[PDB]
């Protein structure tokens, strides 16, 4: 209904660039790509109409974080919209404001919603506002041993220290005693103050048997929100995702609908308006505990993309244009489940020593494509050099079948068919 887009630029590298380029080429839209000086041999620039250099005199990882250079590139090439992908300025509220101030649309939520997300205090306050129960724990950050002692005494003995300044593991240590409690608190506080910025820590109970569920949220500019379905990715090496299962393994239907309704309600209250992710956490007796909200599109969206057979990037671009969901032909009564899917991430981590990253040169590469195998080649090709500056993802392999064991066997066959030497 509103102004169409004629050209789109991406601010990431790797598989997301390829996926967005394919989606745009399906709609007859010109594509613009960016790259750094070190990242000159990748395959994500040959799949774009035009590619430009950025961060000429910067660090290999900080070249992709220079806002003014990206804005200047966007201005001179008559770019209409910019795609933030995931993990590259996607969760920075200032970048969205800069894009808006330059007349360029930003593919995603409004900067106000991004600022509301991010820090955990506002998210917890919003969640406790209506329904969506959260884990017991402190509201304000904790910096004292004594107050930690009262919160330990009140709720329960086993606790985990959760840090701020990074959603990552950080000091993810657990307390089962008091003698180790004091020294662990001292060590964690010292690490937070020294290696990190704010020494913000929280005292909360460690669920003994965690099992977390994700939900994909899609909404338009007219206040219509569509949830796709749930996911399970409980397999975690230490605190990072390993393997994802597209449908729920074994979930009560009442729990399914309750969690879906809670996710929709939370998305409505904040007034969310783009591809978004809502995470959860389930106990053995059954306790849905809210964790956080991801404002970007998640890397494990492909498995949800195949059960529903609804292209997420197409819908994202269309809703960026201004078209409403009913015009696209998307209703919560119109989509349905079809089969099962499994995703596995192929990396260069030695699975014996410490999952330590390995670097070198690829000498032999081969691929396996069958009935239910979808492949997303990021940077894997004959005679490729893997760099130690960026992520260590080679190929994202997805397997689809009519049942869980069938999909697992198909994925095992596909992995056996792969050959990576060197």
């Amino acid at each position: 209904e509103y102004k169409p887009i004629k050209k789109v630029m991406v601010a990431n590298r790797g598989e997301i660039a390829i996926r967005v380029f394919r989606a745009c080429t399906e709609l007859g839209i010109r594509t613009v790509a960016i790259y750094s000086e070190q990242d000159t041999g990748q395959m994500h620039r040959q799949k774009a109409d035009e590619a430009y250099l950025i961060g000429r005199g910067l660090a290999p990882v900080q070249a992709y974080l220079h806002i003014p250079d990206i804005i200047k590139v966007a201005k001179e090439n008559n770019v209409d919209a910019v795609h933030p992908g995931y993990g590259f300025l996607s969760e920075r509220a200032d970048f969205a404001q800069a894009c808006q101030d330059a007349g360029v649309r930003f593919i995603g939520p409004s900067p106000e919603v991004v600022r509301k997300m991010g820090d955990k205090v506002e998210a917890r306050a919003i969640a406790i506002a209506a329904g969506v129960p959260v884990v017991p724990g402190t509201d304000a950050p904790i910096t004292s041993l004594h107050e930690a002692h009262e919160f330990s005494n009140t709720y329960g003995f086993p606790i985990i220290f959760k840090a701020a300044y990074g959603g990552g593991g950080r000091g993810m240590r657990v307390v089962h005693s008091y003698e180790e409690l004091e020294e662990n608190y001292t060590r964690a506080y010292s690490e937070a103050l020294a290696a990190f910025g704010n020494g913000a820590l929280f005292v909360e109970k460690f669920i003994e048997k965690p099992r977390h569920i994700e939900v994909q949220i899609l909404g338009d500019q007219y206040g219509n929100i569509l949830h796709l379905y749930e996911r399970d990715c409980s397999i975690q090496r230490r605190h990072q995702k390993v393997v994802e299962i597209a449908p729920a393994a074994h979930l009560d239907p009442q729990l399914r609908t309750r969690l879906t309704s809670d996710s929709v309600k939370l998305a409505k209250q904040v007034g969310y308006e783009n591809a978004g992710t809502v995470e959860f956490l389930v106990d053995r007796h059954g306790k849905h505990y809210f964790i956080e909200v991801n404002s970007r599109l998640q890397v494990e969206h492909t498995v949800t993309e195949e059960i529903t057979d609804v292209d997420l990037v197409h819908a994202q671009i269309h809703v960026a244009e201004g078209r409403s969901l009913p015009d696209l032909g998307l209703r919560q009564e119109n989509i349905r489940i079809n089969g099962c899917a499994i995703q596995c991430r192929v990396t260069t981590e030695d699975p014996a020593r410490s999952f330590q990253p390995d670097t070198g040169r690829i000498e032999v590469f081969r691929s396996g494509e069958g009935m239910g195998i979808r492949l997303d080649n990021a940077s894997a090709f004959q005679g490729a050099v893997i760099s130690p500056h960026y992520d260590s993802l080679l190929v994202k392999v997805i397997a689809h079948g009519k049942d869980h064991p069938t999909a697992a066997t198909k994925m095992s066959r596909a992995l056996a068919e792969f050959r990576v030497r060197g």
């Binding site: 041999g41 040959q46 774009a48 109409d49 035009e50 590619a51 250099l53 090709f381 005679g383």
Partner: protein, 91 residues
């Protein structure tokens, strides 16, 4: 030859038909010239060094030279080149 329309080439052929035909054949064979570095166009890539060639405002190519083989069966050597991330072999 071709279905391209412009008066400038017609005029140029009017001044010189033969040179125009030869130039058109060369361009149709080897594609877009004059996008190379002068040293690259004059001598060619040095062995196992990465160079860069641009083609448009956004079209830019980085090519690496791998190796050159010897006469295989009919005096047709196989020369090995690398793309931005890929590798090439040519007869």
């Amino acid at each position: 030859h071709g279905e391209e329309v412009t008066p400038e080439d017609v005029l140029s052929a009017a001044m010189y038909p033969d040179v125009f035909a030869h130039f058109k054949d060369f361009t149709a064979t080897f594609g877009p010239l004059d996008s190379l570095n002068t040293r690259l166009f004059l001598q060619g890539p040095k062995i196992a060094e990465e160079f860069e060639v641009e083609l448009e405002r956004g079209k830019t190519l980085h090519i690496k030279a791998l190796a050159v083989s010897d006469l295989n069966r009919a005096g047709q050597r196989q020369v090995f080149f690398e793309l931005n991330g890929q590798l090439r072999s040519i007869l």
